[PDB]
Amino acid sequence: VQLQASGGGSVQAGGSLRLSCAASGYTIGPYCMGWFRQAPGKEREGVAAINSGGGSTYYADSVKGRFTISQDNAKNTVYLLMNSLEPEDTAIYYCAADSTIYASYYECGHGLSTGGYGYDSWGQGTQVTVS
Amino acid sequence: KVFGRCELAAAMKRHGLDNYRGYSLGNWVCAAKFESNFNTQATNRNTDGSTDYGILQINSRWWCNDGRTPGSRNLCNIPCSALLSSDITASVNCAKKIVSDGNGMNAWVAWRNRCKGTDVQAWIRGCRL
Minimum distance, in Å, between the CA of residue A61 and any CA atom of chain B: 20
- Give the number of domains in chain A: 1
Rounded to 5 degrees, φ, ψ at A35 are: -130, 135
At A95, is the secondary structure helix, strand, or coil? strand
The structure's method of determination equals X-ray
Nearest of B102, B103, B85, B83 to residue B93 by alpha carbon: B83
Could you tell me the resolution of this structure in angstroms? 1.5
Domains and CATH numbers, chain B: 1-129 (1.10.530.10)
Which of these is catalytic: B7, B18, B52, B66?
B52
**A123 is in which domain, residue-wise?**
1-131
Residue B23 pairs in a beta bridge with: B20
H/E/C letters for each residue in B35-103? HHCCECCCEEECCCCCEEECCCCEECCCCCECCCCCCCCCCCCCEHHHHHCCCCHHHHHHHHHHHCCCC
To the query of whether residue B52 is one of the catalytic residues in this protein, the response is yes
Interface contact A102-B107, CB threshold 8 A: yes
Chain A contact for B95 (CB, 8 A cutoff): yes
Q: List the single residue in A with minimal CA-CA distance to B57.
A: A104
Nearest CB partner across the interface for B48, out of A56, A99, A101: A56
> DSSP states of A2-28 as a string?
EEEEE--EEE-TT--EEEEEEEES-SS
Nearest CB partner across the interface for A106, out of B63, B95, B109: B109
Rg (CA), chain B: 14
B101 is in an annotated binding site: yes
How far apart are alpha carbons B123 and B30 in whole angstroms?
6
Nearest of A94, A98, A110 to residue A5 by alpha carbon: A94
CA distances from B58 to A13, A67, A100, B55, B99 (A): 46, 32, 14, 8, 12
Nearest CB partner across the interface for A55, out of B48, B56, B58: B48
To the query of whether residue B35 is one of the catalytic residues in this protein, the response is yes
CB atoms within 10 A of CB B129: 11
CATH (domain of A38): 2.60.40.10
Interface contact B59-A104, CB threshold 8 A: yes
Interface subset of A 21-80, CB within 8 angstroms of B: 28, 51, 53-56
Nearest of A25, A1, A2, A7 to residue A80 by alpha carbon: A7
How far apart are alpha carbons A95 and A122 in whole angstroms?
6
